[PDB]
Amino acid sequence: FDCSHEMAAGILKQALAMGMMTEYYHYIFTTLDLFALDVEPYRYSGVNM
Amino acid sequence: FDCSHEMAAGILKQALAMGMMTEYYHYIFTTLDLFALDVEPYRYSGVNM
């Protein structure tokens, strides 16, 4: 995902809704502000970010 | 799931967290108050309830 960290926070929520935050998916983020993302909703799921 | 509808609301949240609300899972509910459950978090996911 090449996009701002605000876009990235938004697209992750949609990805969860879509059954795409699981061990099958690996997401590389272009943003340097990745560390700013609330990651509480996703760390238990097994996705790779 | 044989349990009260309040238990069922609770166990569904845990099932979501666990990557178990998807098209692979089919849940039959014993409770007659199934229709009382907030189903907004789950209807887009493809689970069968």
Swiss-Prot record, chains A, B:
Homotetramer and heterotetramer with GRIK5. Tetramers may be formed by the dimerization of dimers. Assembles into a kainate-gated homomeric channel that does not bind AMPA. Can form functional heteromeric receptors with GRIK4 and GRIK5. Can form functional heteromeric receptors with GRIK3. Interacts with DLG4. Interacts with NETO2. Interacts (via C-terminus) with KLHL17 (via kelch repeats); the interaction targets GRIK2 for degradation via ubiquitin-proteasome pathway. The chain holds residues 228 to 276 of 908 of the full protein. This is Glutamate receptor ionotropic, kainate 2. It comes from the Eukaryota. Sumoylation mediates kainate receptor-mediated endocytosis and regulates synaptic transmission. Sumoylation is enhanced by PIAS3 and desumoylated by SENP1. The postsynaptic actions of Glu are mediated by a variety of receptors that are named according to their selective agonists. This receptor binds domoate > kainate > quisqualate > glutamate. It does not bind AMPA without coexpression with GRIK5. Ionotropic glutamate receptor that functions as a cation-permeable ligand-gated ion channel, gated by L-glutamate and the glutamatergic agonist kainic acid. L-glutamate acts as an excitatory neurotransmitter at many synapses in the central nervous system. Binding of the excitatory neurotransmitter L-glutamate induces a conformation change, leading to the opening of the cation channel, and thereby converts the chemical signal to an electrical impulse. The receptor then desensitizes rapidly and enters a transient inactive state, characterized by the presence of bound agonist. Glycans are attached at N48. The gene is Grik2. Belongs to the glutamate-gated ion channel (TC 1.A.10.1) family. GRIK2 subfamily. It comes from Rattus norvegicus. It is found in: Cell membrane; Postsynaptic cell membrane. Highest expression is found in the olfactory lobe, piriform cortex, dentate gyrus, hippocampus, granular cell layer of the cerebellum, and in caudate-putamen.
